[PDB]
Design a protein around this nucleic acid. Structure first.
Ligand code: MG
Ligand code: MG
Ligand code: MG
Ligand code: MG
Ligand code: MG
Ligand code: MG
Ligand code: MG
Ligand code: MG
Ligand code: MG
Ligand code: MG
Ligand code: MG
Ligand code: MG
Ligand code: MG
Ligand code: MG
Ligand code: MG
Ligand code: MG
Ligand code: MG
Ligand code: MG
Ligand code: MG
Ligand code: MG
Ligand code: MG
Ligand code: MG
Ligand code: MG
Ligand code: MG
Ligand code: MG
Ligand code: MG
Ligand code: MG
Ligand code: MG
Ligand code: MG
Ligand code: MG
Ligand code: MG
Ligand code: MG
Ligand code: MG
Ligand code: MG
Ligand code: MG
Ligand code: MG
Ligand code: MG
Ligand code: MG
Ligand code: MG
Ligand code: MG
Ligand code: MG
Ligand code: MG
Ligand code: MG
Ligand code: MG
Ligand code: MG
Ligand code: MG
Ligand code: MG
Ligand code: MG
Ligand code: MG
Ligand code: MG
Ligand code: MG
Ligand code: MG
Ligand code: MG
Ligand code: MG
Ligand code: MG
Ligand code: MG
Ligand code: MG
Ligand code: ZN
Lengths: 50, 81, 119, 60, 101
RNA sequence: AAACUUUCAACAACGGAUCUCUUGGUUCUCGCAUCGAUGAAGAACGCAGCGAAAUGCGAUACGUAAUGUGAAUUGCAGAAUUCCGUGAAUCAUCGAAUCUUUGAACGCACAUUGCGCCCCUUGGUAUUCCAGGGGGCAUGCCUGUUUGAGCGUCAUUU
RNA sequence: CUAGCGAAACCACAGCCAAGGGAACGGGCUUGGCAGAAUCAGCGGGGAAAGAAGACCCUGUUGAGCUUGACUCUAGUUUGA
RNA sequence: GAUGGGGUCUUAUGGCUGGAAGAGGCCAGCACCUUUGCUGGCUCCGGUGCGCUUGUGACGGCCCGUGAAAAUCCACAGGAAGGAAUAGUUUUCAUGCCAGGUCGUACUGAUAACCGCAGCAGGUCUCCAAGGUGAACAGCCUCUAGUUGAUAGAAUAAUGU
RNA sequence: AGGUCGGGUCGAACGGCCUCUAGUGCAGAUCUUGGUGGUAGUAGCAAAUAUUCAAAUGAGAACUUUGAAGACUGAAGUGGGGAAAGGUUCCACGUCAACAGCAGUUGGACGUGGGUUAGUCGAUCCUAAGAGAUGGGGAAGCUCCGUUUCAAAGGCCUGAUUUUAUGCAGGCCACCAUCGAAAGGGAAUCCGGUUAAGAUUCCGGAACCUGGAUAUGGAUUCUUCACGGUAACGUAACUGAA
RNA sequence: UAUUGGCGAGAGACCGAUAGCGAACAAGUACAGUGAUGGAAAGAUGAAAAGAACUUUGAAAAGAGAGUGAAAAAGUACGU
RNA sequence: UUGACCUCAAAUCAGGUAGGAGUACCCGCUGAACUUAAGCAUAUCAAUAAGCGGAGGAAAAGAAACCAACCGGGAUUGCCU
């Protein structure tokens, strides 16, 4: 909603900061196992349930 | 009409976030959390909920203080330098 | 590089405060450059030096308070020992070694004797 | 336009601008950005020039 | 079998009385000293309708004998009581319609 | 007769079986006793030159101090004196600190980053108003202190 | 019908009939009739077509809902000490 | 204690003035890589109504239905106390000074932003509502605004809807 | 039952025999997990009246953009705003591997950034239905009842004092936690302009409310706390505690 | 004397990635549900990235060569 | 009048303590049913699971109001029986 609480807006801000791909220099580290962001979230496919 | 057209009438959340567990299990009318029992003093736990106990027991978090008591015991709760 | 705690420990608290506020000035001056330049690794040394100065200040003030409360009961709870709640609530060595005079008389009269057995 | 700690109010913002830059501030309007930080629009009096002091800070 | 309807009535969940539009409990004045040793005079300020009740109520105003104030009792209006009427309540009150002998 | 259908072989596909691996699990045995109102476990939100997560940490924020080792870290950039030294390191150790907002959670609340009160101090021509800074204000119970209440009750009065 | 995109049900193996016998109604077995690649659009005879371990009936020393003068109790209430 | 004559008041509302034409709107002319302007005018006076929508007023009808509470603010009764003369007393009159924190604020609100496993013909609360026909926010056509989205092409058999 | 050799592939461990041991041999269980077929390039992608022409971009245009034409929603709209809900979908730049059940140069997609400004709009305050501590009383107990109750339940103004702090001087007061409405109640803001995306919030102008300080003018007074009007009442003011 | 928890160790005629704890991996994670709860899948290039410079076709993805490597019958869709 | 005593209060009085977590084991309370009896009700499952309260490194128990019947033994706990 537009008139929202600060707790909800803070969780929304954290989700906006988390919604990003990998920094591609991480695939260059030795003994790297991470290929992509498996915890990626889109607003059309899954809801935060908050 | 008990299915798809009734699912369109669902826009009033029964549960919101609990302050103790951040869960979205805090019932807004009962004013109680369904998972941690807030605002009760004791944490909701059940021996039939062994998996839930395993999910929320000690060690599933940071242990900001309890990590170090073993080292302090091994050194004998020493002081100074 | 940064500052050194052993050479900061020689100074007074006013010099430490001046050092701290100019270090904060430099931290702001590097934060305004971090947006212009791609990378600015110099900011971490200033951040850790601020942390070191704050640590030294806290240690000096805490030692002053310890020497103020020296040699008396009821020192503050953050300054007295932490060990554990149970160990803090346990009996002292004195209170544990307290015995009645009857047991003391019995222990003096008949202590466990040291003896061997062949002849 | 400054980025401001989330615990600061307009009084603290105004006082700290007056201390750190020796500028008299007309008014302060703050918001909380969608990334979780706080932004402050600080309008100075007509005597001072924000353009004159911005490059004095080191950015323009 | 289930719990039947008259058995459910005693829990008082949805079977409580709807008391939003009621003026208060219609009680007599307390038997303090004046009503048992003499009389006291009040005045009917207004005769009003009470929701959920077939009889009209009457707001009688007395003076407090011990403090400078006005007390307002709610009587059930007797047939013939009008506004502005003086009600006399007590042992020495005269036998008239509205009195509390 | 081709095409098509079926069977077999080679090569190529599909898919992930088999084989060989293994910083993981499971079971047994031995030793030890160590959470918390001096604020635990847990949670939320943040913190890196370039990080989303895990791990670490708390506005001193992948950490500070102390001690030891003794020249790294590393994907890149950067820094060099940090290199015959009170001294590198995402090192080890850890006895000093910091420890946001919470949480048994403790000023009152809380689907609110809501609403107060007291002390000290600073500024606004201010005991009262506003604002900043610091420090506090829960309940039950124990010991003691002080102030009291009760023809419960004693003595002493005039 | 064409360009592009493109499932599902179902599937022992499959798929021409007559009679016989047969678990007494065969696509396969026996005896006959016959039988020629590959197919397209329809169609509803058959595939005892598909959909569900028949819901009717019976059995189970399997239940459950309900009823009562079934058996055994019981909350409550009543009477005495 | 009518009608009548003369007055008093509430200021919903409306009128004039200020705000305020300097704004905004409609035009004309001069211009120029250009920031692009600059300069002129005009913005006036009315009328109508079982009209639509909405607000309000005075009434009337209905009830075995008579149709919230508190915070908050003001007034009155009272007469406590304080009060002037070389001086005061007043800040419900006017002017003048300072400050007004915290959180939200974007966007959709649905034949694509919500819920239905989905970019689902379903469901999901409410405000504004032009002209004509016509009793009519019916049906049909149009203006402002908004779309022109839903796999398409060619033929025109049966059986379908 | 199986065993052995040859050939090919492969790259790191493995076998014969005598014994021991077992989570030891699969075709079925409408078996479990995973994968793959025929059906089959098949059913189908047919509601919501409808699209067409040229140019541009681009490797590529039935579908993108612009223009033109034709239409529709038809103000109980396919319009303009909001509530719940969602949470960055908003806007810009780049972009087409996947998604948009055709396509795609386009997009609510992908990548990178920007954006939400309030004394006056709301929340905050009040209380409603109701929820719910405390004093108490139940209950082995988790906890239950009850919300003014079998409570010793507190705070308000004036000051006085000017070791002075705020006690003592006094005086008044008896409600008796708190939570509960973004549609109830409620102090106060409008116009014009402005951005890619914000506005009753920003800029300009013009106001208003609350709280606090306060000085000047005005008013009133020697009849101390105003006058006028028959009156309804009037005014710039024109003490007023419990 | 007990001890399926915690801390620290040592072991096994145990299992060897559909097994073994649900979890050998950013696992009580992703995700579902209003909620209590439910709850996965997923290991292996090569000794070393030496991860294919460069030419050519293509709008591009890629292909064909060339090249690295013991081996591309190891090309980040990677052991067999 | 003054000073005690008793009882009961109030203090952001001085100094303390309790809560909660974990719970494999330990001390209690509470407390089933599936099941078996080839049915089923006592019984059994079981003085168990779930629920609640309370501890430690162990806890509990423990130095006889004991066992015995013998030529008597001699706190408690655990093993073999
Ligand atoms: Mg509903
Ligand atoms: Mg509800
Ligand atoms: Mg704001
Ligand atoms: Mg036949
Ligand atoms: Mg057959
Ligand atoms: Mg035969
Ligand atoms: Mg034949
Ligand atoms: Mg044929
Ligand atoms: Mg048919
Ligand atoms: Mg048929
Ligand atoms: Mg059938
Ligand atoms: Mg059957
Ligand atoms: Mg039988
Ligand atoms: Mg039965
Ligand atoms: Mg009977
Ligand atoms: Mg008249
Ligand atoms: Mg008006
Ligand atoms: Mg209307
Ligand atoms: Mg906004
Ligand atoms: Mg908006
Ligand atoms: Mg909108
Ligand atoms: Mg709407
Ligand atoms: Mg709309
Ligand atoms: Mg959806
Ligand atoms: Mg769903
Ligand atoms: Mg309308
Ligand atoms: Mg007409
Ligand atoms: Mg019409
Ligand atoms: Mg379609
Ligand atoms: Mg090898
Ligand atoms: Mg087996
Ligand atoms: Mg098989
Ligand atoms: Mg078989
Ligand atoms: Mg099968
Ligand atoms: Mg077709
Ligand atoms: Mg169709
Ligand atoms: Mg497509
Ligand atoms: Mg495509
Ligand atoms: Mg967009
Ligand atoms: Mg209660
Ligand atoms: Mg409230
Ligand atoms: Mg409100
Ligand atoms: Mg309102
Ligand atoms: Mg109302
Ligand atoms: Mg907008
Ligand atoms: Mg303005
Ligand atoms: Mg006058
Ligand atoms: Mg596994
Ligand atoms: Mg598994
Ligand atoms: Mg090879
Ligand atoms: Mg190979
Ligand atoms: Mg069993
Ligand atoms: Mg039986
Ligand atoms: Mg049986
Ligand atoms: Mg039975
Ligand atoms: Mg149990
Ligand atoms: Mg003991
Ligand atoms: Zn909770």
């Amino acid at each position: 909603a537009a008139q929202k609480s600060f707790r909800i807006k803070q969780k929304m801000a954290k989700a906006k900061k988390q919604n990003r791909p990998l920094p591609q220099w991480i695939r260059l580290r030795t003994n790297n196992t991470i290929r992509y962001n498996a915890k990626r979230r889109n607003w059309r496919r899954t809801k935060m349930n908050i | 009409g008990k299915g798809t057209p009734s699912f369109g009438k669902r826009h009033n959340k029964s549960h919101t976030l609990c302050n103790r567990c951040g869960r979205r299990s805090f019932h807004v009318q009962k004013k109680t959390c369904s998972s941690c029992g807030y605002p009760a003093a004791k944490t909701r736990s059940y021996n039939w909920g062994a998996k839930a106990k395993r999910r929320h027991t000690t060690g599933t978090g940071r242990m900001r203080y309890l990590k170090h008591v073993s080292r302090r015991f091994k050194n004998g709760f020493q002081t100074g330098s | 590089a940064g500052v050194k705690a052993y050479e900061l420990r020689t100074k007074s608290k006013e010099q430490l405060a001046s050092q701290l506020v100019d270090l904060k000035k430099e931290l702001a001056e590097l934060k305004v450059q971090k947006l212009s330049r791609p990378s600015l690794p110099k900011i971490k040394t200033v951040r850790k030096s601020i942390a070191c100065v704050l640590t030294v200040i806290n240690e000096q003030q805490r030692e002053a308070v310890r020497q103020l409360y020296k040699g008396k009961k009821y020192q503050p709870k953050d300054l007295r020992a932490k060990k554990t709640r149970a160990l803090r609530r346990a009996l002292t060595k004195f209170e544990a070694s307290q015995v009645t005079e009857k047991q003391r008389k019995k222990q003096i009269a008949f202590p466990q004797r040291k003896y061997a057995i062949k002849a | 336009v400054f980025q401001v700690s989330m615990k600061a109010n307009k009084y603290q913002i105004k006082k700290a601008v007056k201390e750190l830059y020796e500028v008299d501030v007309l008014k302060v309007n703050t918001l909380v950005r969608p990334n979780g930080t706080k932004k402050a629009y600080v309008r100075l009096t007509a005597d001072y020039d924000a353009l004159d002091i911005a490059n004095r800070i080191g950015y323009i | 079998g289930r719990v039947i309807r008259n058995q459910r009535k005693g829990a008082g969940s949805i079977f409580t009385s709807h008391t939003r539009l009621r003026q208060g409990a219609a009680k007599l004045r307390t038997l303090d000293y004046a009503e048992r040793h003499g009389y006291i005079r009040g005045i009917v300020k207004q005769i009003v309708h009470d929701s959920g009740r077939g009889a009209p109520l009457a707001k009688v105003v007395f003076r407090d004998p011990y403090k400078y104030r006005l007390r307002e009792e709610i009587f059930i209006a007797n047939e013939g009581v009008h506004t502005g009427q003086f009600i006399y309540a007590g042992k020495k009150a005269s036998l008239n319609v509205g009195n509390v002998l």
